[PDB]
Amino acid sequence: STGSATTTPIDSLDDAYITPVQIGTPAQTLNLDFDTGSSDLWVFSSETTASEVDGQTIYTPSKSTTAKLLSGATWSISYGDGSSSSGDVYTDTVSVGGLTVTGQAVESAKKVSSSFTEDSTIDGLLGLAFSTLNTVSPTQQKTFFDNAKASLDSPVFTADLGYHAPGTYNFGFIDTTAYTGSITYTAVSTKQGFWEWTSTGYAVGSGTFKSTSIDGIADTGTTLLYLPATVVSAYWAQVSGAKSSSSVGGYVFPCSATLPSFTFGVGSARIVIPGDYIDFGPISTGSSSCFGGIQSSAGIGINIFGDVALKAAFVVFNGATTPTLGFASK
Numbered sequence: 001s002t003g004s005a006t007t008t009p010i011d012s013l014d015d016a017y018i019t020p021v022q023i024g025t026p027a028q029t030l031n032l033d034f035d036t037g038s039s040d041l042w043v044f045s046s047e048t049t050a051s052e053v054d055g056q057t058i059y060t061p062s063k064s065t066t067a068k069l070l071s072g073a074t075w076s077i078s079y080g081d082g083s084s085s086s087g088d089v090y091t092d093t094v095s096v097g098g099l100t101v102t103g104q105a106v107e108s109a110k111k112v113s114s115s116f117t118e119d120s121t122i123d124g125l126l127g128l129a130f131s132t133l134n135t136v137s138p139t140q141q142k143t144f145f146d147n148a149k150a151s152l153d154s155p156v157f158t159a160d161l162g163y164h165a166p167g168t169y170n171f172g173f174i175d176t177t178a179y180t181g182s183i184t185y186t187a188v189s190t191k192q193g194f195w196e197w198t199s200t201g202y203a204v205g206s207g208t209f210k211s212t213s214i215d216g217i218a219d220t221g222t223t224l225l226y227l228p229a230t231v232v233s234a235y236w237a238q239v240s241g242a243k244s245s246s247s248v249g250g251y252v253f254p255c256s257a258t259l260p261s262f263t264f265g266v267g268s269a270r271i272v273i274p275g276d277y278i279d280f281g282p283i284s285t286g287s288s289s290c291f292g293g294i295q296s297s298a299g300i301g302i303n304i305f306g307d308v309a310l311k312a313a314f315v316v317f318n319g320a321t322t323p324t325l326g327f328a329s330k
């Protein structure tokens, strides 16, 4: 079987993408952030502290005839940005675009950090990294993808994120009408639990392609592109007036400038990120300084191919026994 769902940017900057997901019987529809950088399906719920909820749709297990409390199980997660949440665990039926999984672990948030409370458009996360990163204790739980793998026609899902426009998450099949040319596949290391791969190099604008290995993760749950300091310096050196700002915490540039494109290598193929994709607008309302979509990974410890890069391509997450990542222009 297969599944297909539309994903929609939450704001005018493509800061995140939400996808409707049906939980429980009868269905309770929540808009979740599909995150290939984590492995927990957690939701705002009727158990979440009342002061920590500001407009989100909540999951109510007491109204679901298929929800079962997973006795003794707890979860606690901390994200690379300092976000955090925790609670208990239910099992319930979960459907994504027609694709249904029974007995999926649904982690009910009892406490959420402020960054989640202030985001009224995101009702929770659906993790799509490898199940070894799941935080449920004492019994680790499988992701939605891992539980659906056996029933899928093909053990793959694809991300087709839009630039200021809706996109598509497909489960179980590859839409050959959604990309141009061929798909270039590259090896994935699962040793850290991520969709970790190695890019073959980069180029800035119309400049020479620099062949160099960049190890990083494909993360739909991260907004920006985080690359080594040498690469990021070479990019912003081509933008007049650009500078790294300690008070802002990243590279900023004059909003009147035009940004060059950024190319990254996938094997022998090249994915081109248009310069417009790197513009994330004024650092504050009315400011003439704009925030850059390519930032240094030095403070993070790992390079992250976030939405800025991924939305420039059709991306195949091949969860075969030897997992691979496929990239294609679109």
Ligand SMILES: NCc1ccc(C(F)(F)F)cc1
Residues within 6 Å of the ligand: 035, 036, 037, 038, 079, 080, 081, 219, 220, 221, 222, 300, 302, 304
């Ligand atoms: N999108 C989930 C995520 C967030 C942060 C990280 C970090 F910081 F650990 F790399 C990995 C995955």
Ligand SMILES: NCc1ccc(C(F)(F)F)cc1
Residues within 6 Å of the ligand: 016, 033, 035, 037, 079, 081, 083, 115, 116, 119, 122, 221, 222
């Ligand atoms: N990378 C996972 C993630 C996704 C969204 C958020 C936000 F936007 F809610 F802060 C935090 C962490």
